């Protein structure tokens, strides 16, 4: 759930002095019109609007600045610059009475992985594998990027994966739970949303790593393959039972890796259900393989995001003759930076195909 402990002119024009997301603080007057809510929650309100100068659509995430908790969302977003992470254009502050709200002006992205998957579900179809490949690959790229700065998202789930259906570009959003993890410094365990929470988090670990994002990603993958969440359940126990019912009871050593405080309890020994029986018979073997290397009890045994990008499941995306089903070409996929590849530079031989060099 939670983390650790303006003038109006004439359509109707709202003018504010907003600070650009990148570079040194150099605030500039920003004007926008056609404001409407495209989302509302206990966190605040999300609006769509159109910038007066360029006519470009933006999202404005308005969040209350609660001083009772640690708010790293702005601090974290400002440092991020990646093609698979939603762009922070500007931010500004505005006035619950006697309260100050933070406004994040972001690029507007019309869909999410969640809404798109819901379409296939109610249509009783499955998302074509080509999209599963495209979306998951871009997700892993975004994870490789944030992890290289030591930043863990902590809330990976389909609702936080924005999509432009025309370009098939995925952008990771919502850094309201994100944090730079430091070994030796404890974290909040009640993080990550139900269905997507790593087993070590459910066992209440406070010393977890960025590999919790990888588990969440594995859940997204499985969900896209399956047509529904793989580990549903209201409570942690409910969720862990679903996990055990697939992976089998974790061994004492796997338990120790997750949370040593549970090593001495005598858990009934449930047999693993073969991944090939979990999914439909027409599921590609390499998708199953990838999934099993993501959804591991031992956090250190999980693939890193960069390793996941290099997995054989994404081999098709490296074929020069591939295209989107709508006729268009695939988005940028091989423009890796030195930062992105820092965890494992030799992987560039796989990640950057020969036809991508030119």
């Amino acid at each position: 759930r939670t983390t650790s402990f303006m003038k109006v002119s004439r359509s109707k024009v709202t003018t504010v002095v907003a600070t650009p997301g990148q570079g040194p603080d150099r605030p500039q007057e920003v004007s926008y019109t056609d404001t409407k809510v495209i989302g509302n929650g206990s966190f605040g309100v999300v609006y769509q609007a159109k910038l007066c100068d360029s006519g470009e659509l933006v999202a404005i995430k308005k969040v209350l600045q609660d001083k009772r908790f640690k708010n790293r969302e702005l601090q974290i977003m400002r440092k991020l610059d990646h093609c698979n992470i939603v762009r922070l254009r500007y931010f500004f502050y505005s006035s619950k009475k006697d309260e100050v709200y933070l406004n994040l002006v972001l690029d507007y992205v019309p869909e999410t992985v969640y809404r798109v998957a819901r379409h296939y579900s109610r249509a009783k179809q499955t998302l074509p594998v080509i999209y599963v490949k495209l979306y998951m690959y871009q997700l892993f790229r975004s994870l490789a990027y944030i992890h290289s700065f030591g930043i863990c998202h902590r809330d990976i789930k389909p609702q936080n994966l924005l999509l432009d259906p025309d370009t098939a570009v995925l952008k990771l959003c919502d850094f309201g739970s994100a944090k730079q993890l430091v070994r030796g410094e404890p974290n909040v365990s009640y993080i990550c949303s139900r269905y997507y929470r790593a087993p070590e988090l459910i066992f209440g670990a406070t010393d977890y790593t960025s590999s919790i994002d990888v588990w969440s990603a594995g859940c997204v993958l499985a969900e896209l393959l399956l047509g529904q969440p793989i580990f549903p359940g209201d409570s942690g126990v409910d969720q862990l039972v679903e996990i055990i019912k697939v992976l089998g009871t974790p061994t004492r050593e796997q338990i120790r890796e997750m949370n040593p405080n549970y090593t001495e309890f005598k858990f009934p020994q449930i047999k693993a259900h073969p991944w090939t029986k979990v999914f439909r018979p027409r599921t590609p073997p390499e998708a199953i393989a990838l999934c099993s290397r993501l959804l591991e009890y031992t956090p250190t045994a999980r693939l890193t995001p960069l390793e996941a990008c290099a997995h054989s499941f994404f081999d098709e995306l490296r074929d020069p003759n591939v295209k989107l089903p709508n006729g268009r070409d695939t988005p940028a996929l091989f423009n890796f930076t030195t930062q992105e590849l820092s965890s494992n530079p030799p992987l560039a031989t796989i990640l950057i195909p020969p036809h991508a060099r030119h």
């Binding site: 066992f203 209440g204 126990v237 862990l240 039972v241 019912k245 009871t249 549970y262 858990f267 449930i270």
Partner: peptide
């Protein structure tokens, strides 16, 4: 939550899907 309390519930639940 208490590891003891969490484990008891989990053990109880795993016995039911096992039996």
């Amino acid at each position: 939550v208490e590891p003891q309390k969490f484990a008891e519930e989990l053990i109880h639940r795993l016995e039911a899907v096992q039996r």
